[PDB]
């Protein structure tokens, strides 16, 4: 889901 | 391609009452990623709920969201005057995000038959070869209202358009304006111009007319 | 506190292309998803697509694929929507919207949903030409037809593009005023009416003037409406 990408990014 | 269906389209309540709005998805929504937005006329939408049941800081605690899977609900424990607006649901459980068609939450009030006015075309407009006839339905409730134009007792079709104001913030009524546009040539071939109005607050359809040249 | 400011209204000819900007201030720009949502007059919201600045990863809705382009200028915290091959049906208010963050502040975990929106940009796609409206009186006297109440008004006809504004007696008169949303005629021109209900007894003594203003054509008109 495109809408989940910023989360994975934020957890980095 | 997830389809969200909000039903009903319109909910008629009053300040102090509890409201329940539903959103049904044509297929399960991933991770319950459903959001609710409130939108007032001419204004940008405002986020109320996200993740189906999470409420961001800043949003009144009277707003609540529940559900999962394919059936979601937005609850407002008790309505305040500014809460009467359009509510939209949105799913972002897939890259292709989609919005529901929206549910209007209006104020329910006593039936009020409309005051009907009819206006012939101005001489000035006529000078240019065009005749607009305007029918006005003032301060009525409920919003459902039918207006038919009859020229010398001939139902008109395709030659008129209508507009409806937003519900009045004070008297909770609606007004409707219908314009019938003919060319001056056709306009001059008929004598009687009538506006027939059908409304729940009217025992029988009301008619307003004038004879060209009076 | 995230504020999104968009560029002004635009008028485009069918077949042309339009670019709308969205300037962000507050929070982090490059790490949060920025989408574009539109809304045709009287219709609902429709997500078009968005972009993740840092990764430049875009996501467009299928019905706009190959006609839309969204980019982001991290140097200016500005995002852009470019829609080509414009059609009349593309006429709408376009909004940019950034996803929100959990809890307070604007740096927490993203939430996907759109917490921040721009004021919106009206984009009119038509082959019509800019034009001031003709203003005709909606004169009052049909035995008033409804109590001691009289109705009078102004027909603001054939203008382009939206919007137009109406006030009565320079704003001195506001009670009983009803300015209706404009309707788009087949001619490609807009038309709307503004009416006010008043005591029928004031028809013989009060002057009623509607002030009509169409900024796009720099048109200002004051029409006295008489019985």
XYZ file of C-alpha atoms in Angstrom:
453
model
C 0.000 0.000 0.000
C 1.418 3.361 -1.069
C -0.202 4.900 2.018
C 2.014 2.762 4.299
C 5.367 3.887 2.911
C 5.827 7.039 4.997
C 5.366 4.958 8.105
C 8.195 2.549 7.246
C 10.139 5.700 6.417
C 9.271 7.304 9.746
C 10.353 4.208 11.671
C 13.784 4.408 10.060
C -11.392 -0.514 -6.972
C -13.103 -0.183 -3.609
C -16.509 1.488 -3.635
C -17.782 3.160 -0.490
C -21.545 3.555 -0.171
C -22.834 6.008 2.420
C -26.529 5.661 3.221
C -28.765 7.455 3.608
C -27.720 10.464 1.566
C -29.554 12.842 3.887
C -30.206 12.589 7.626
C -32.711 15.009 9.237
C -31.954 15.799 12.875
C -31.621 18.664 15.347
C -29.076 20.116 17.794
C -28.785 17.839 20.824
C -29.610 14.643 18.957
C -27.394 11.643 18.228
C -26.327 10.949 14.655
C -25.146 7.701 13.083
C -23.644 7.641 9.579
C -22.709 4.438 7.774
C -20.172 3.641 5.060
C -20.152 0.241 3.334
C -17.180 -0.917 1.257
C -17.641 -3.187 -1.788
C -14.791 -5.248 -0.348
C -12.908 -5.433 2.936
C -10.766 -2.409 3.796
C -7.137 -3.213 4.555
C -6.006 -2.575 8.109
C -9.221 -0.678 8.773
C -7.814 2.349 6.985
C -11.011 4.346 6.768
C -11.254 8.062 7.462
C -14.143 10.488 7.968
C -14.274 14.112 6.864
C -16.656 16.954 7.554
C -17.168 19.574 4.888
C -19.107 22.807 5.067
C -20.171 24.643 1.872
C -17.332 26.363 0.045
C -14.888 25.150 2.678
C -12.069 22.618 2.640
C -12.777 19.207 4.210
C -11.743 18.635 7.840
C -10.484 15.278 9.154
C -12.535 13.792 11.989
C -11.539 10.158 12.312
C -8.761 8.000 10.895
C -7.936 4.327 11.220
C -11.702 3.850 11.519
C -11.760 4.764 15.220
C -8.896 7.137 15.964
C -9.643 10.807 16.577
C -6.905 13.421 16.131
C -6.235 16.109 18.702
C -8.350 19.161 18.013
C -11.454 17.204 17.024
C -14.384 17.530 19.453
C -14.783 14.450 21.624
C -18.413 14.152 20.498
C -17.136 12.610 17.275
C -16.544 8.863 17.338
C -15.882 6.156 14.782
C -16.255 2.388 14.921
C -16.403 -0.649 12.688
C -14.047 -2.798 10.663
C -14.021 -4.917 7.526
C -16.682 -3.609 5.155
C -19.020 -1.743 7.478
C -18.042 1.444 9.274
C -19.897 4.035 11.322
C -19.423 7.645 12.384
C -21.219 8.654 15.570
C -21.837 12.088 17.038
C -23.164 11.668 20.590
C -24.955 15.014 20.465
C -25.208 17.447 17.563
C -24.162 21.096 17.830
C -25.320 23.771 15.323
C -22.090 23.720 13.307
C -22.245 19.946 12.935
C -24.874 20.155 10.223
C -22.872 19.600 7.098
C -21.739 16.913 4.694
C -19.727 13.970 5.932
C -17.476 11.895 3.683
C -15.773 8.551 4.317
C -12.502 7.543 2.677
C -10.547 4.324 2.439
C -6.796 4.330 1.985
C -6.343 0.603 2.509
C -5.094 0.350 -1.066
C -2.982 2.632 -3.237
C -6.128 3.609 -5.092
C -7.814 5.740 -2.427
C -11.544 6.424 -2.818
C -14.256 8.585 -1.192
C -17.894 7.836 -0.409
C -20.440 10.108 -2.114
C -21.152 11.872 1.154
C -24.038 12.081 3.582
C -25.766 15.354 4.322
C -26.805 16.054 7.889
C -29.480 18.737 7.826
C -31.763 20.211 10.487
C -35.279 18.763 10.651
C -37.925 21.399 11.378
C -41.686 21.888 10.997
C -43.066 21.670 7.489
C -43.252 25.103 5.916
C -45.019 25.593 2.602
C -43.046 27.892 0.296
C -44.068 31.431 -0.621
C -44.213 31.438 -4.421
C -43.307 34.362 -6.677
C -43.106 34.559 -10.454
C -41.232 37.261 -12.400
C -41.826 38.099 -16.075
C -38.789 39.023 -18.192
C -37.580 42.621 -17.957
C -38.123 44.923 -20.929
C -34.355 45.420 -21.052
C -33.626 41.701 -21.491
C -36.366 41.463 -24.136
C -34.741 44.212 -26.185
C -31.923 41.736 -26.910
C -34.242 38.992 -28.154
C -34.237 36.820 -25.015
C -36.905 36.247 -22.334
C -36.086 34.700 -18.961
C -38.928 33.811 -16.643
C -38.079 33.255 -13.015
C -39.984 31.321 -10.372
C -39.067 31.639 -6.703
C -39.878 29.237 -3.881
C -39.039 31.057 -0.636
C -38.224 29.541 2.786
C -39.633 26.024 2.578
C -39.093 22.720 4.391
C -38.511 19.870 3.656
C -36.150 20.427 0.727
C -38.001 18.136 -1.684
C -39.969 20.359 -4.063
C -41.152 20.082 -7.646
C -41.564 22.996 -10.016
C -43.059 22.658 -13.487
C -43.287 25.374 -16.091
C -46.399 25.583 -18.226
C -46.770 27.949 -21.167
C -50.400 28.246 -22.298
C -50.932 24.963 -20.473
C -48.050 23.146 -22.122
C -45.581 21.444 -19.819
C -42.096 22.699 -20.597
C -38.981 20.584 -20.866
C -35.317 21.178 -21.560
C -35.628 24.953 -21.376
C -35.188 25.664 -17.655
C -32.716 25.246 -14.786
C -32.983 25.608 -11.030
C -30.770 26.367 -8.046
C -31.318 25.813 -4.294
C -29.687 27.745 -1.444
C -28.048 25.953 1.488
C -30.272 25.454 4.537
C -30.709 28.743 6.366
C -28.719 28.932 9.597
C -31.599 30.675 11.407
C -34.955 29.361 10.132
C -33.653 26.053 8.736
C -35.477 26.561 5.461
C -34.481 26.287 1.812
C -35.264 28.542 -1.133
C -35.328 27.529 -4.766
C -35.001 29.577 -7.917
C -36.080 28.257 -11.311
C -35.379 30.083 -14.553
C -37.204 29.384 -17.810
C -35.373 30.722 -20.842
C -36.978 31.136 -24.243
C -36.048 33.237 -27.247
C -38.105 36.439 -27.533
C -39.630 34.948 -30.703
C -41.015 31.846 -28.995
C -41.836 33.915 -25.933
C -44.131 36.149 -27.985
C -46.108 33.195 -29.380
C -47.712 32.430 -26.020
C -49.951 34.294 -23.588
C -50.028 32.485 -20.254
C -46.847 31.713 -18.328
C -47.279 29.580 -15.225
C -45.160 28.033 -12.494
C -46.674 24.992 -10.795
C -45.202 24.107 -7.404
C -45.644 20.808 -5.580
C -44.559 20.563 -1.931
C -45.360 18.479 1.171
C -46.477 21.599 3.013
C -49.085 22.279 0.320
C -52.465 20.551 0.384
C -52.617 20.957 -3.396
C -50.090 22.170 -6.008
C -49.783 25.955 -6.089
C -49.673 27.926 -9.343
C -48.301 31.373 -10.105
C -48.758 32.854 -13.530
C -49.024 36.026 -15.545
C -50.260 36.924 -19.026
C -47.600 38.342 -21.337
C -48.297 42.066 -21.277
C -50.073 43.192 -18.101
C 0.957 23.635 12.764
C 0.857 22.832 9.069
C -0.519 25.385 6.625
C -0.846 24.701 2.912
C -1.252 27.661 0.560
C -2.274 27.100 -3.046
C -1.980 29.151 -6.226
C -4.938 31.156 -7.560
C -7.946 30.351 -9.724
C -7.210 29.449 -13.336
C -9.165 29.474 -16.604
C -7.993 26.920 -19.166
C -9.119 26.119 -22.720
C -10.063 22.511 -23.462
C -6.994 20.530 -24.467
C -4.578 22.761 -22.556
C -2.625 21.931 -19.405
C -2.769 23.419 -15.900
C -0.283 23.499 -13.037
C -1.341 24.161 -9.450
C 1.166 24.760 -6.669
C 0.852 24.059 -2.967
C 3.302 25.696 -0.561
C 3.721 24.114 2.858
C 4.966 25.692 6.071
C 5.318 23.837 9.369
C 6.178 20.234 10.205
C 8.296 18.079 7.877
C 7.677 18.337 4.131
C 9.724 15.581 2.466
C 8.740 12.693 4.725
C 4.931 12.992 4.604
C 2.573 12.001 1.774
C 1.013 14.916 -0.132
C -2.119 14.177 -2.224
C -4.372 16.110 -4.597
C -8.149 15.868 -4.278
C -10.658 17.565 -6.523
C -14.342 18.379 -6.422
C -16.608 19.354 -9.309
C -19.385 21.882 -8.502
C -22.066 20.113 -6.469
C -20.237 16.766 -6.598
C -18.177 14.808 -4.080
C -14.474 14.438 -3.304
C -12.207 12.448 -5.612
C -8.626 11.465 -4.757
C -6.411 11.977 -7.785
C -2.963 11.017 -6.575
C -0.081 12.083 -4.392
C 3.661 12.001 -3.918
C 6.234 11.272 -1.240
C 8.817 14.086 -1.772
C 11.873 12.380 -0.274
C 11.494 9.186 -2.296
C 9.787 10.916 -5.234
C 7.456 7.914 -5.254
C 4.200 8.972 -6.882
C 0.810 7.233 -6.850
C -1.917 8.220 -9.336
C -5.540 7.065 -9.662
C -6.061 4.928 -12.808
C -8.490 7.332 -14.483
C -5.878 10.081 -14.478
C -2.872 7.983 -15.466
C -0.911 9.475 -18.356
C -2.575 12.879 -18.046
C -1.393 13.807 -14.568
C 1.994 14.688 -13.048
C 2.694 15.421 -9.391
C 6.121 16.567 -8.179
C 7.672 18.202 -5.125
C 10.306 20.887 -4.663
C 11.935 20.115 -1.334
C 13.928 23.343 -1.577
C 10.681 25.301 -1.379
C 8.410 22.813 0.409
C 6.209 23.218 -2.658
C 4.238 20.442 -4.344
C 2.781 20.622 -7.859
C -0.114 19.118 -9.817
C 0.050 19.217 -13.612
C -3.010 17.955 -15.477
C -2.815 17.784 -19.272
C -5.366 17.334 -22.040
C -7.925 19.294 -20.004
C -11.627 18.675 -20.689
C -14.684 20.719 -19.571
C -15.438 17.931 -17.090
C -12.167 18.741 -15.318
C -13.706 22.001 -14.060
C -13.366 21.780 -10.295
C -11.869 23.007 -7.059
C -8.511 21.256 -6.603
C -7.092 20.706 -3.122
C -3.694 19.541 -1.955
C -3.705 17.657 1.321
C -0.947 16.329 3.515
C -1.375 13.301 5.741
C -1.483 13.971 9.470
C 0.641 12.699 12.352
C -0.329 10.788 15.506
C -0.951 12.646 18.743
C 0.096 16.284 19.039
C 2.857 17.966 17.082
C 3.415 17.281 13.392
C 6.435 14.979 13.529
C 4.951 11.802 14.945
C 3.998 8.634 13.121
C 2.142 9.422 9.877
C -1.540 8.439 9.704
C -2.332 8.321 6.001
C -5.579 10.279 6.400
C -5.590 13.924 5.292
C -5.331 16.224 8.312
C -4.005 19.239 6.437
C -5.659 20.865 3.435
C -5.017 23.886 1.262
C -7.685 26.540 0.653
C -8.356 24.993 -2.740
C -7.909 26.258 -6.300
C -10.857 26.629 -8.708
C -9.868 25.437 -12.179
C -12.301 26.274 -14.973
C -11.879 24.452 -18.283
C -13.944 26.020 -21.029
C -13.785 27.606 -24.471
C -15.925 30.545 -23.339
C -14.529 34.076 -23.188
C -14.256 36.248 -20.086
C -17.395 38.353 -19.870
C -19.291 40.645 -17.517
C -22.900 39.703 -16.687
C -25.996 41.523 -17.853
C -28.091 42.453 -14.831
C -31.861 42.458 -15.211
C -34.414 43.445 -12.566
C -36.808 40.930 -11.050
C -39.476 43.546 -10.364
C -42.038 43.091 -7.561
C -45.838 43.276 -8.013
C -48.065 40.276 -8.280
C -50.580 41.462 -5.623
C -47.504 40.324 -3.668
C -49.152 36.889 -3.923
C -48.089 35.895 -0.415
C -49.143 37.905 2.624
C -47.826 41.388 3.248
C -44.514 39.994 1.909
C -43.016 41.163 -1.377
C -40.167 39.580 -3.331
C -37.847 41.401 -5.699
C -34.425 40.646 -7.104
C -31.772 40.739 -9.795
C -30.975 38.295 -12.566
C -27.210 38.260 -13.152
C -27.071 36.715 -16.619
C -24.468 35.271 -18.997
C -21.128 35.790 -17.351
C -17.862 33.906 -17.343
C -16.135 32.671 -15.473
C -17.240 32.177 -11.874
C -17.509 33.762 -9.390
C -19.659 36.916 -9.116
C -20.766 38.602 -5.923
C -24.036 40.303 -5.048
C -25.009 42.601 -2.207
C -28.043 44.829 -1.738
C -28.011 48.531 -0.909
C -24.218 48.345 -0.612
C -24.529 45.755 2.111
C -27.005 47.681 4.251
C -29.691 45.086 3.464
C -29.023 41.458 4.391
C -32.094 39.982 6.079
C -34.345 38.079 3.698
C -31.570 37.971 1.110
C -31.098 34.872 -1.062
C -28.307 34.686 -3.621
C -28.574 31.367 -5.476
C -25.612 29.292 -6.671
C -25.018 29.951 -10.356
C -26.066 27.453 -13.004
C -23.962 26.609 -16.051
C -26.042 27.111 -19.201
C -25.548 25.132 -22.417
C -24.094 28.312 -23.919
C -21.112 27.834 -21.631
C -22.065 30.937 -19.640
C -23.117 31.168 -15.980
C -26.283 32.687 -14.625
C -27.655 33.175 -11.127
C -30.201 35.273 -9.329
C -30.300 37.200 -6.077
C -33.603 37.993 -4.391
C -34.755 39.555 -1.170
C -38.168 39.391 0.467
C -39.428 42.572 2.058
C -42.608 44.039 3.509
C -44.895 44.842 0.585
C -45.508 48.239 2.211
C -41.883 49.250 1.660
C -42.160 48.784 -2.123
C -43.461 52.315 -2.445
C -40.812 53.970 -0.283
C -37.549 52.025 -0.076
C -35.009 52.024 -2.889
C -33.677 48.592 -3.755
C -30.313 48.419 -5.476
C -28.348 45.239 -6.093
C -24.588 45.671 -6.355
C -23.114 43.139 -8.756
C -19.387 42.567 -9.076
C -17.553 40.272 -11.494
C -13.837 40.687 -10.782
C -12.680 38.534 -13.759
C -14.009 41.138 -16.193
C -13.558 44.068 -13.832
C -17.313 44.667 -13.968
C -19.298 46.506 -11.298
C -22.982 47.222 -11.753
C -25.674 48.831 -9.625
C -29.197 48.067 -10.762
C -32.162 49.799 -9.161
C -35.067 47.365 -8.985
C -38.463 49.100 -9.085
C -42.114 47.979 -8.876
